Amino acid sequence: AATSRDALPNTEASGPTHSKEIPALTAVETGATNPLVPSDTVQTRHVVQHRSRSESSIESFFARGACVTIMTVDNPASTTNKDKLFAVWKITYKDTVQLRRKLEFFTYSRFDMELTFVVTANFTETNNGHALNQVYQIMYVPPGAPVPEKWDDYTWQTSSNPSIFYTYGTAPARISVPYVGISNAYSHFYDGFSKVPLKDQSAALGDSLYGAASLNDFGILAVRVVNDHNPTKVTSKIRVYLKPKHIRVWCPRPPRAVAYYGPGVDYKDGTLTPLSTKDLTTY
Amino acid sequence: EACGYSDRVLQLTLGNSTITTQEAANSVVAYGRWPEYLRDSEANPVDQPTEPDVAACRFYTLDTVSWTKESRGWWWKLPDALRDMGLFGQNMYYHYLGRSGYTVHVQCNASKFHQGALGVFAVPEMCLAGDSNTTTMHTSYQNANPGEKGGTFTGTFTPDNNQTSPARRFCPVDYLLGNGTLLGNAFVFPHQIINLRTNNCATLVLPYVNSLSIDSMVKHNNWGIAILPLAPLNFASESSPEIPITLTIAPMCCEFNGLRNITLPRLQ
Amino acid sequence: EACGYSDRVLQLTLGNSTITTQEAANSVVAYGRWPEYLRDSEANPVDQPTEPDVAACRFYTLDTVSWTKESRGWWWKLPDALRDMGLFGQNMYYHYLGRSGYTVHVQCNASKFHQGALGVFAVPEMCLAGDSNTTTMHTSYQNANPGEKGGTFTGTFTPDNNQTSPARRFCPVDYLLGNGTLLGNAFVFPHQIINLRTNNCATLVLPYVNSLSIDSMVKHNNWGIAILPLAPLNFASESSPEIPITLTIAPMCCEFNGLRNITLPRLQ
Amino acid sequence: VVQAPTQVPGFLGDSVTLPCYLQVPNMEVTHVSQLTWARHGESGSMAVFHQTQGPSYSESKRLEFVAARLGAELRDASLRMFGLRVEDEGSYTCLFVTFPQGSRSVDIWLRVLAKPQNTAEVQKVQLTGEPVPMARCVSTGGRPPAQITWHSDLGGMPQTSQVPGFLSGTVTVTSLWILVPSSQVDGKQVTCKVEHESFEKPQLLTVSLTVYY
């Protein structure tokens, strides 16, 4: 029954004590934390508590759109020798550090995902020619489906795959995604491997990455500029904001204390000394 | 009990094995959840499961390690550590899938004149950091799984420099819990402290924890048992004292699915 | 309590201060009377009294003294000893009259291999003997009131011979309780014994005692705290051992009358 | 704009200053102008020089702050760390706050220890052949070892062996000696060049020789 936004427990008036009861004394060895309160070790007055833990709730803590990646695409002049640049990003929360550290305060997680897309474009050459309003195509390519090889090949038809046709200058694109995990909950950490090295079978064959499950967790985001090659080249950037909604978390963990080094828990030399100098007897 | 009963004195009995202790600091039950069999509402694999019961759900005592002024800490992984233990290891290898809880009993006695504190921690999905700075998540299956003898922590991070023929193994630094996070905070995890002046040991009852109802026991390790010296071993005046740390563990309410021919892993 | 509770383990809490003890020989309440405020039926001074409560009725820890094979004993006087203690001393000096009870907690720990017994006594109107044989009742206000640091007992009576410029101070001989009576009998007075093998300390709850309902705290000392070695300090084999005796005291149900300008005594 | 020059050795002993200059352009002048210093450093999250109105010492007792504060200037402030132990690096940062855009700055850090001392001693009597006369170039007290170099006047120099580092209190010590063989004269300006790159020009010590009988 207790709501995240209900007022915390009121402080009760407490007088002097000369008894056989020893709240202050305990034994951390047992694995437990002393449930003590001000009134147990000192003389307290009566206080009607109005404060709440509303903003510190799991949803409230993550109820914010966080940048997980920056995709770069473009639309050159037909003539250019180099290919029209279309973006292919492998979906994940580890390419950036902020949101990853927050999710990582916990072992397992569960949640509906809200993806918001902020698109910005600009001119690259000290030219003067212009360009008509661009229309972007954000296609979701799930593991197994034909991944695009050309800004304009057959795959962009998206007969089955989900595509978002964004129009430049308009309110940032947005879509919702359910809990799509092949497991009963997302695994922020996997203490094992995708393969079992069998004696009877050649070393190289049974080999696999540590802490890495499905080589292709959730497929990829394939972005392109639908508009045909324009005399004057225009480069665009797609910023992807990820927000975890209707979220649940299990088994808490100590926050990442040192600089992230790859998709795993690996740390790197020269970054292992976080804490600063401060003397035992100095305030 | 005015009758005699007490927190410090316990008696644990599983199958044909019984453990007694006159100096315990009570016992801990991970996340308040006592080990249990897979429920029908939560079940996945449709085949009649194999439940060894007393044959596997009993107490196995691993190789006794030595605690000294120099020791930086020790680590083990479940089920990996029990992989070669009687009928439990046999049933684990014969089946594709398997799930199990554990009763972890860490034994370490001394004397009223000795000092020291062992921080005993039960960590879910205890992913450890590798020995390489040129590559990542590269620690080999053979090295990531020491079996019964387990592994150990280092006071210093020293990168594998042999690019040609990589050690392909873990470099778990003590103060960083071997995984990029500050040891001082490891306590958010199910644990107990073996403080020589207060108690002989640590008893942790661990439930089956995981993103799935049941999984591959051979490919994946559910729990990590980390033992670090919070306060260094110390005795009378001896410059180089020593005391044994014996680790006894018992699988619980454990069950297996997908029976076939025995799995012969490349453990070396 | 089959639940755990015991005579040896106590927790005392007054205002913002709390004292804990795992090795106590229970606690003593002088003449079976717990400190209390001045009743209307027994009141004298007609003006609205000043009751500091938590600001003064808390635990003050005086300067820690050292117990050794040589020590003959120590003495203190109340309220004198607390005269310079935070808000309690301030309120005592600002008022003509004042009355107060006390919770006296004498702390002194050692080891299962140490020996010795501290006789801790609470004496009403503890009038002490002077250093002069040519004159009497001559001990000066400055010397009769040592304040927080208190005074000490002597195994021998050595008379002040300087007739010209008299030391004008006390010569309290240990075996005579510093006052003409045999120490062996000091036990008729509210007390406790700190026997190293049995307990860490002594807790005495003292009531406001006196021929009057309320009096001059600055001119007159109601209680005398005498600490003598019944059995001499002794350790293993060390020829000159040592252990600290820390004295913590807390005023109780204390109240004051006749408010005016602050009293600046000639304490030297 | 941010123009901090602080890449400073930094001399040990100690003590020296840890400056921070932020020259201000120039027609869009800066306030509020509080100045923060964050160490680098187990920063969770303080060993800080912060200065709102009155200069506030975030607790690293061994600090000296010298800026025209409680009023304003604004900040080309200087800090000082004494002392006097090698509470080293690591690194230090210097961040400002601004009403316009400038709740921001730059991390800027450097060095540490320092410096040695030298003397020359020459003996003993020449009974040849054919080693020492003997000139010794003692180098006492310098953790980053001072590059002692014995040279002289002639091709009778290739002969220069070293006492390595059996370190004193935190600080390394060495002795280069020669040897130089045999025979007679006094008499040459044989110069030991001890460096370390501190002070002025490297410690050039010229001496003589013990000639006997």
Ligand SMILES: CCCCCCCCCCCCC/C=C/[C@@H](O)[C@@H](N)CO
């Ligand atoms: C047109 C836009 C369509 C967008 C399609 C998005 C579907 C894919 C979402 C995958 C969600 C992944 C969230 C993070 C999971 C990781 O923590 C896993 N390694 C843990 O199990």
